[PDB]
Amino acid sequence: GLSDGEWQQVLNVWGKVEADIAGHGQEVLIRLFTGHPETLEKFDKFKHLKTEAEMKASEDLKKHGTVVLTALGGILKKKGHHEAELKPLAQSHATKHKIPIKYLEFISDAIIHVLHSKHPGDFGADAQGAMTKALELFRNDIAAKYKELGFQ
Numbered sequence: 592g593l594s595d596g597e598w599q600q601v602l603n604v605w606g607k608v609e610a611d612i613a614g615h616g617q618e619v620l621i622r623l624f625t626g627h628p629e630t631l632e633k634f635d636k637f638k639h640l641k642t643e644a645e646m647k648a649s650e651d652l653k654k655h656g657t658v659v660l661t662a663l664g665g666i667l668k669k670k671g672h673h674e675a676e677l678k679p680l681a682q683s684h685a686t687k688h689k690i691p692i693k694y695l696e697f698i699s700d701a702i703i704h705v706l707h708s709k710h711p712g713d714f715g716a717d718a719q720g721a722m723t724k725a726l727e728l729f730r731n732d733i734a735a736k737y738k739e740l741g742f743q
């Protein structure tokens with residue numbers, strides 16, 4: 592798990608995201624969709640988005656970004672004590688949405704990229720290490736639920 596110091600870094604970085612939840616959420620999703628177009632196909636509501644311009648201009652995409660990062664933020668604030676929060680997400684993403692764990696790897700990488708892009712020189716080596724750990728914990732706990740379900 593993460594140390595106390597590491598959690599404090601994670602939640603410090605998260606303060607940056609909370610100042611513009613929609614903006615961060617939008618850029619995370621755009622980074623995901625442009626970098627991995629197959630991910631767009633998982634969203635009936637975004638598969639019409641043919642271009643990044645269209646993505647950028649989609650208010651519904653920004654809305655979904657807000658939903659996504661709010662759920663993640665709730666999880667992070669549990670500092671690993673997130674069974675109740677993570678379980679339903681694992682379950683909807685395996686059973687309803689059919690999201691392979693690879694796609695969660697993709698979006699983890701996207702969050703790290705977006706943090707550097709929006710805060711260049713203000714996302715330190717230590718902060719990246721701690722946020723990366725937190726994201727991997729999230730992914731790893733989901734992967735455990737995926738194995739339970741025999742998904743992917």
Ligand code: MNR
Pocket residue numbers: 630633634635636658659660662663679680683684688690694695698
């Ligand atoms: C590659 C695609 C997927 C990735 C990666 C992904 C990663 C993540 C993620 C990691 C940080 C968080 C947090 C996250 C959180 C959510 N997510 Mn998700 N998610 N996610 C979807 C695809 C994906 N998610 C699909 C598709 C829906 C249904 C969208 C709709 O039509 O409303 C969805 C829905 C949701 C919902 C709405 C409630 C529900 O359905 O469980 C939340 C909350």
